[PDB]
Amino acid sequence: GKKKVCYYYDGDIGNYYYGQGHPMKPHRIRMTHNLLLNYGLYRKMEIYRPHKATAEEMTKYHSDEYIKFLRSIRPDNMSEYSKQMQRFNVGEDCPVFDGLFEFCQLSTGGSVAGAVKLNRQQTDMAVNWAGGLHHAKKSEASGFCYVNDIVLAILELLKYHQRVLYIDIDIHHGDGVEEAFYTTDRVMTVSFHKYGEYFPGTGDLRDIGAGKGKYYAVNFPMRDGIDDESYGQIFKPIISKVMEMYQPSAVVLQCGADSLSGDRLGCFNLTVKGHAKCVEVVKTFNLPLLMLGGGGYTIRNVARCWTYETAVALDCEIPNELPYNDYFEYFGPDFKLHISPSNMTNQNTPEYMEKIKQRLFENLRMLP
Numbered sequence: 001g002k003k004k005v006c007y008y009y010d011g012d013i014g015n016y017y018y019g020q021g022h023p024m025k026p027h028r029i030r031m032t033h034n035l036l037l038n039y040g041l042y043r044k045m046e047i048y049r050p051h052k053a054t055a056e057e058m059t060k061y062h063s064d065e066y067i068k069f070l071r072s073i074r075p076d077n078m079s080e081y082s083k084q085m086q087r088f089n090v091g092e093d094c095p096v097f098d099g100l101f102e103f104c105q106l107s108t109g110g111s112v113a114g115a116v117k118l119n120r121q122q123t124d125m126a127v128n129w130a131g132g133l134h135h136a137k138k139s140e141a142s143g144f145c146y147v148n149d150i151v152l153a154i155l156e157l158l159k160y161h162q163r164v165l166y167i168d169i170d171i172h173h174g175d176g177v178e179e180a181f182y183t184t185d186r187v188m189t190v191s192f193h194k195y196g197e198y199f200p201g202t203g204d205l206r207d208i209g210a211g212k213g214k215y216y217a218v219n220f221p222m223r224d225g226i227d228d229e230s231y232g233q234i235f236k237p238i239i240s241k242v243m244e245m246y247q248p249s250a251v252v253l254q255c256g257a258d259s260l261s262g263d264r265l266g267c268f269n270l271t272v273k274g275h276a277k278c279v280e281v282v283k284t285f286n287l288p289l290l291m292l293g294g295g296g297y298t299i300r301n302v303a304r305c306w307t308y309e310t311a312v313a314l315d316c317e318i319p320n321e322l323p324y325n326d327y328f329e330y331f332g333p334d335f336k337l338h339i340s341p342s343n344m345t346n347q348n349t350p351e352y353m354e355k356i357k358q359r360l361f362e363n364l365r366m367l368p
């Protein structure tokens with residue numbers, strides 16, 4: 001049936017600035033919010049302002065030393081932390097910016113609050129577009145991510161759920177999440193990503209987990225230019241097999257929008273409909289679902305993607321003609337919600353797609 005959706009957003013989020021030339025723009029979360037408000041989606045869901053996650057919350061995963069450094073580091077005292085910055089990988093991809101810790105606290109707070117809401121059985125779905133920062137490690141920032149809100153949200157879910165399924169549709173491999181749960185069968189991690197001389201360099205299909213976690217990490221490595229047809233060819237069959245074999249009681253879906261056509265950093269060719277079909281596929285399983293953000297660098301397309309995926313979560317049809325909004329000029333020259341794929345070559349042949357799927361199916365046969 002139609003589901004109860006709780007959505008997390010803090011109006012301050014859009015003001016956090018990574019710095020001149022940095023592609024990660026928290027402003028895209030505000031654009032997403034303003035667009036979905038203008039479509040009238042607030043009438044169908046509960047809108048919550050997340051709390052600022054504390055150090056006690058963050059240290060359920062991250063080390064005390066790393067969190068203390070994030071809590072202390074500022075552009076004014078940077079010069080006194082040169083060594084600490086190199087140790088925790090802060091300074092280039094993961095810059096020090098005003099309000100960095102507070103940005104982490106709000107990104108994390110939405111994911112953790114959403115997980116609590118699902119655990120209490122007070123919502124069917126929880127949405128946190130400021131979350132999904134999949135690369136952060138126990139004691140290290142990485143790929144524009146500092147605090148792993150996903151790992152913290154899954155640890156919250158594990159209090160009430162024996163098995164939690166994690167699915168990652170961002171163009172980049174969900175390394176941080178896969179790493180945290182690599183040796184456990186209590187979380188199965190499933191990542192679809194561009195692989196081969198691409199950030200972060202991990203997610204080979206041969207990386208399948210270790211110890212009790214062997215066969216509980218799934219990687220689908222892809223080439224440049226994947227399209228809606230090819231993605232759709234494998235996503236439903238793989239998720240269906242995962243659901244059948246793994247039988248999770250809760251799901252976390254990372255919806256990184258950098259897998260869309262025309263992304264500033266991405267090299268895929270999905271449309272918003274192709275991306276959102278993933279949400280529709282996961283939705284059909286009727287399991288408690290936490291939907292998260294992630295990458296996404298062509299901000300107009302990020303706002304379109306996450307607005308449509310919120311409408312999909314709500315089973316609410318919305319017009320293709322964009323309503324007026326505070327960022328209306330960003331959506332030109334068309335002013336439409338949906339996007340067209342580019343003429344880029346799809347390097348993922350149908351044979352390649354079927355072969356990787358068959359290899360992953362062999363691995364899934366190894367589950368109890």
Ligand SMILES: O=C(CCCCCCC(=O)Nc1ccccc1)NO
Pocket residue numbers: 021022023092093135143144170171172199256258265294295296
């Ligand atoms: O989307 C991501 C993170 C991608 C991180 C890519 C790191 C390399 C990079 O492009 N860094 C960079 C570029 C311009 C300015 C500063 C850093 N994960 O899902």
Ligand SMILES: [Ca+2]
Pocket residue numbers: 168169170171172173174191192193
């Ligand atoms: Ca991914």
Ligand code: NA
Pocket residue numbers: 181182183184185186187188189209213216217
């Ligand atoms: Na695992």
Ligand SMILES: [Zn+2]
Pocket residue numbers: 170171172256258294295296
């Ligand atoms: Zn990404």
